[PDB]
């Protein structure tokens, strides 16, 4: 499969999450995603075929994971935006007020602004701290997906949101949305990963 940020993959033939970013760890290919999406050694599939397994994760506390891929996978420096693509150029962290977009398999590509950093989400499993909040909308299934600026700077991966009864927070004004993502930089340094860029 071609590994592009934002696309669907399943975990052990049951949950769905979205690909965050293509990365490498030495000769190993992988992608970063959300920790709550799978446990270590869970099987990741893209379009019915096995692409790799969860190599490491931390959830709750943090919400991060990376999946090591078989070498048949093609890592691409891109994030899906409809039929188009946003090229990944690096991971400079944007400040509050900066505009940002996110990509995932439920709601597609959505944009908004970073509204706060170092937010704690209190999920049923336990607290996840240190998250950044934006007001781009998102829905169940978008977890693990790319948050990136239009300029191509990778910000992080989707963690959670104030989901409404329709499965997303796209039907409430931006002012009322809390969509939270896990910062990319601590994930890259914790697993010694390098981002694929173009």
């Amino acid at each position: 499969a071609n590994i592009v940020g934002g696309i669907e993959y399943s975990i052990n033939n049951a949950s769905l999450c979205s690909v965050g970013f293509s990365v490498t760890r030495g000769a190993t290919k992988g992608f970063v995603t959300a920790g709550h999406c799978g446990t270590v050694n869970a099987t990741a599939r893209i379009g019915g075929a096995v692409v790799g397994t969860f190599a490491a994760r931390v959830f709750p506390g943090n919400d991060r994971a990376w999946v090591s891929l078989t070498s048949a996978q093609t890592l691409l420096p891109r994030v899906a935006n409809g039929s188009s693509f946003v090229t990944v150029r690096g991971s400079t962290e944007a400040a509050v007020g900066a505009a940002v977009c996110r990509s995932g398999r439920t709601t597609g590509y959505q944009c908004g602004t970073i509204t706060a950093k170092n937010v704690t989400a209190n999920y049923a499993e336990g607290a996840v701290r240190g998250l950044t909040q934006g007001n781009a909308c998102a829905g169940r299934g978008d977890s693990g997906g790319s948050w990136i600026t239009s300029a191509g700077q990778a910000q992080g991966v989707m963690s959670g949101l104030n989901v409404q009864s329709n499965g997303n927070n796209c039907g409430i004004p931006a002012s009322q949305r809390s969509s939270l993502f896990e910062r990319l930089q601590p994930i890259l340094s914790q697993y010694g990963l390098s981002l694929v860029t173009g």
């Binding site: 959300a34 209190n122 999920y123 949101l161 809390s178």
Partner: peptide, 4 residues
């Protein structure tokens, strides 16, 4: 907020 809930995971996703």
């Amino acid at each position: 907020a809930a995971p996703a």
